[PDB]
Design a protein around this nucleic acid. Structure first.
Lengths: 54, 109, 119, 44
RNA sequence: GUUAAGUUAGAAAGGGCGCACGGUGGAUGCCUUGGCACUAGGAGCCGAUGAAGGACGGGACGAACACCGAUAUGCUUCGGG
RNA sequence: GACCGAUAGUGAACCAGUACCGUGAGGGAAAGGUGAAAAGCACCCCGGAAGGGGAGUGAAAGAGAUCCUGAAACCGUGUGCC
RNA sequence: AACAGUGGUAGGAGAGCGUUCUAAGGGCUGUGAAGCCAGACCGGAAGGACUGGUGGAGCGCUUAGAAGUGAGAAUGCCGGUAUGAGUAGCGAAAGAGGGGUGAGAAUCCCCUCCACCGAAUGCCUAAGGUUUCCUGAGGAAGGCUCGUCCGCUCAGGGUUAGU
RNA sequence: AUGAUCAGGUUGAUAGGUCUGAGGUGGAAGUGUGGCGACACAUGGAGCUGACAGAUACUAAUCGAUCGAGGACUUAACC
């Protein structure tokens, strides 16, 4: 249970080539103005599905 | 052509680079949106200094909010805080608390 | 199946009882997603129970929900407030007395919050 | 799991105190060489 | 534009090699307040008339160095300036 | 001084026999450099600040508090070829 | 000119290269030295020039002398930085919900339920520690996360005995 | 395990409710009777039911967005 050799630079990058994290999914808010996630209520306008939520 | 830097903000540079690389080369007005809507540790810091970067237009040479894009931007290491976490068998292992420099250079197109 | 919520059955049951009492208390809950998903079904069977509204129903709902104060000036306890007001309000809609609104996750842990309200 | 050092001010000053070291001749040599060395805390 | 079987650029999730610009880190160069070894000279003891060395304390705020001793960041009394 | 020029030279060029370790005897470090002068950043913008971007001083700001020079390991960013 | 020779460990011999000082003579330098960085230049070698960029004051050459004089290895020593690897771990435990502060709230404060201990995880008080106690500010470091918070920092304040 | 696969996303039965069931536990409470009494009876195969199977638009699968074709030489063959 020990690394027998050091891992070289290209091996290190080649392992890390999948560890990049994906973008979220944005959608334009029902209330105008800004960006929001899908299926989340609006953070700024405070609305969802056209309806208003306090 | 505006530039702002972070200059040793206490955060691991790799954990910075992961959320940092996804805004490379796209329009700022939606880049700020995707970045404050992704939950990461680094997102408020890069949010802050990116808004400072676009904010270098007020008492500055004049550009405008639209037609403006990130040209190039990167994360650079700062000096590391040496810390010694105690460990079993009295071994006294050593840990590194890293700091990072974050660069944003933004130009109009 | 049904979720475990990261705790064994005793404090799990105590947890759900406490949340549903809170729901009847203030008709609107902010909590995480999975607590909301397993919350919905149980509070709405208590709503069916209150709609039934007989004495066997009173004792059954007493055996699960707990006695807080719900309208202090009338000293209305949660049981009687349920059994009088909310059953009379929602007697007509034969199911689905709950709504889930999802939000952005918390700063602390990225736990996905949800809005629960009774409607 | 009683460790190797229990603190006691009285026994400490009795067995390593300034009077205790000055009482002996050999302790006087200890004082002299420590003072020549220049230690801040010169005796216990 | 159908065959048919043949021949070939082409890519890049990423990477490799060169180039450029960075950061980190403090090597190198330069410098010296210090130190080493000596030369010539002086001096080669102090202490109950209380030593060596300390503790405490003293300043327009308070710490530490340095100075001093309830006469406490000094004083009297000769000289230099 | 055909002695050293800060991993050297005393352990100690720097509040060192200190910090620290040991119950005690004892052991015993690391740590020099802005500028000629602080003339050390008025004022504005981002921000809670930190930090930056401007304006100003200087011969220099890449000279802005380990601040002369800033090699290498290491780590990034664009790319010419594959 | 001719002839012959020219693998090589231990080894032995001869030629040299380079560094720091020191004298002698010569000169180079803010019109930019040393050092650094980059080049497709020169010699048989160790190496040595030239041209740019940085740098902002010292240094070559000639001949001779004197050396703390040449590093890749010693499980060498010191400093810095990689690899594991975004992995292991995050140190016995039941919270949850609403309000409030705040730039930011699972972690701070208020309230309601629930839970745990209870010959103790309660209350006094030794040894020991020495302000950690209280109040008001602050959140760079300490807090195995966060932290508006404290046993952290800062500024004050606090211990009264004839028994 | 996460990816992945599959069923679904408002002209829809995907999941959770509601109603009806299967099945399981088995005689709920509250009444009234008898009994001093612990109790036993009737109301009544009552009451309750996690995953199971049918219906039901009650609640949630909304507005969005992103990716993703335009095609080289010869022999046969015919526009």
């Amino acid at each position: 249970a020990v690394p027998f050799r050091r891992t070289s630079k290209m091996k290190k990058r080649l392992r890390r080539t999948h560890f990049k994290l994906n973008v979220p999914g944005m959608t334009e808010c029902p209330s105008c103005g800004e960006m929001k996630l899908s299926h989340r209520v609006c953070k700024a306008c405070g609305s969802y599905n056209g309806k208003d939520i306090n | 052509q505006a530039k702002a830097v972070a200059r040793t903000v206490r955060i691991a540079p790799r954990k910075a680079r992961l959320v940092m690389d996804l805004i490379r080369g796209k329009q700022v007005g939606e880049a700020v949106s995707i970045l404050n809507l992704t939950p990461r540790a680094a997102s408020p810091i890069i949010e802050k200094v990116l808004k400072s970067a676009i904010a270098n237009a007020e008492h500055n040479y004049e550009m405008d909010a639209n037609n403006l894009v990130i040209s190039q931007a990167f994360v650079d290491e700062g000096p590391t805080l040496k810390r010694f976490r105690p460990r079993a068998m009295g071994r006294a292992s050593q840990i590194n608390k890293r700091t990072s420099h974050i660069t944003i250079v933004v130009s109009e197109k | 199946s049904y979720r475990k919520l990261g705790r064994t059955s005793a404090q799990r049951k105590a947890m759900l009882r406490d949340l549903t009492t809170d729901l009847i208390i203030n008709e609107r809950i902010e909590t995480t997603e999975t607590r909301a998903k397993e919350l919905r079904s149980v509070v709405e069977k208590m709503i069916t129970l209150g709609k039934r509204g007989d004495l066997h129903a009173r004792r059954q709902a007493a055996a699960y929900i707990r006695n807080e104060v719900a309208n202090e000036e009338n000293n209305q306890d949660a049981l009687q407030k349920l059994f009088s007001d909310i059953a009379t309000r929602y007697e007509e809609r034969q199911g689905g007395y709950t709504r889930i609104m999802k939000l952005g996750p918390r700063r602390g842990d990225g736990a996905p919050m949800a809005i629960i309200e009774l409607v | 799991m009683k460790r190797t050092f229990q603190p006691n001010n009285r026994k400490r000053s009795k067995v390593h105190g300034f009077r205790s070291r000055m009482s002996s001749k050999n302790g006087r040599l200890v004082l002299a060489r420590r003072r020549r060395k220049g230690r801040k805390v010169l005796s216990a």
